[PDB]
A paper describes a structure:
Using X-ray crystallography, we show that the ciliopathy-associated centriolar protein CEP120 contains three C2 domains. CEP120, for example, plays a key role in the duplication, elongation, and maturation of centrioles, which in principle could impact the production of a functional basal body (Comartin et al., 2013, Lin et al., 2013, Mahjoub et al., 2010, Wu et al., 2014). All three C2 domains of CEP120 (C2A, C2B, and C2C) adopt the PLC δ1-like topology II and are structurally similar to each other (root-mean-square deviation [RMSD], 2.4–2.6 Å), with major differences found mainly in their loop length. Thus, the CEP120 C2 domains probably play a role as protein-protein interaction modules.
(but not from Homo sapiens [H.s.]) we obtained diffracting crystals that allowed a structure determination at a resolution of 1.6 Å. The structure revealed a β sandwich formed by two antiparallel four-stranded β sheets, a fold characteristic of C2 domains. In human CEP120, both the V194A JS and the A199P JATD mutations fall within the C2B domain. In our structure of C2B from Oreochromis niloticus, the equivalent residues (V195 and A200) point inward toward its hydrophobic core, suggesting that they play a structurally analogous role in stabilizing the C2B fold. The point mutations V194A and A199P, which cause Joubert syndrome (JS) and Jeune asphyxiating thoracic dystrophy (JATD), respectively, both reduce the thermostability of the second C2 domain by targeting residues that point toward its hydrophobic core. Our structures revealed neither complexed Ca2+ nor potential Ca2+-coordinating top loop residues or cationic β-grooves. Prime candidates for interaction interfaces in these domains are the regions defined by strands 3 and 4 at the edges of their β sandwich that constitute their most conserved parts. Strikingly, other structurally characterized C2 domains engage their binding partners using exactly the same interface. Both residues V194 and A199, targeted by the JS and JATD mutations, are located near this putative interface in CEP120 C2B and might disrupt its function as suggested by our in vitro experiments.
Numbering used by the authors: 166 to 346
Write the structure that this text describes.
């Protein structure tokens, strides 16, 4: 059988592994912290000034559709750092194995029903460093590049440096009783 995160609807947590053996509570969280150079993902300066331009981040976390607080200033992002968390009932070994087997988290920058770009954040990398969950939280954090869904990326003017659209993301796994700190 495949390891699956099974929503327990009444209680508001996901069971991973057999419920009689995997009984500890964990929190898995995603924080979108800041962004820069997002204007490269919009082909026209004119769309930046339309007020229908309202942008947000989307991702699926263990099957949960998550959207962030909409913001308007793409050139100078104004959104607040925002965390989404899910509760998991599991065991340390089974949850670490489950996470090591998950595909990367794909975080999208959206406008309306359009994805302007996405970036991959490895949950398996987080599992790989989740080696002291009895005592410490484990966190992968960095500046992740947002890639447009186009075949060809055009850059005008072409410079020696290449500042790309970037999203600061932190993904954290911890025992529920272990403070993020």
């Amino acid at each position: 059988e495949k390891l699956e995160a099974i929503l327990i609807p009444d209680q508001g947590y996901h069971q991973v592994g057999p419920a009689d053996l995997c009984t500890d509570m964990f929190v898995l969280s995603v924080t979108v912290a800041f962004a820069t150079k997002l204007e490269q993902l919009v082909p026209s300066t004119m769309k930046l000034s339309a007020e229908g331009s309202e942008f947000f981040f989307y991702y699926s976390l263990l099957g949960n559709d998550i959207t962030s607080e909409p913001f308007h200033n793409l050139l100078s992002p104004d959104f607040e750092p925002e965390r989404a968390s899910v509760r998991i009932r599991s065991s340390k070994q089974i949850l670490k194995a489950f996470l090591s087997q998950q595909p990367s988290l794909q975080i999208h920058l959206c406008c309306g029903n359009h994805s302007l770009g996405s970036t991959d954040v490895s949950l398996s990398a987080l599992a790989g460093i989740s080696t002291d969950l009895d005592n410490k939280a484990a966190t992968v954090e960095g500046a992740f590049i947002l890639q447009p869904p186009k075949r060809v990326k055009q850059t005008l003017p072409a410079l020696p440096t290449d500042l790309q659209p970037t999203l600061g993301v932190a993904v954290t796994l911890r025992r529920e009783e272990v403070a993020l700190q």
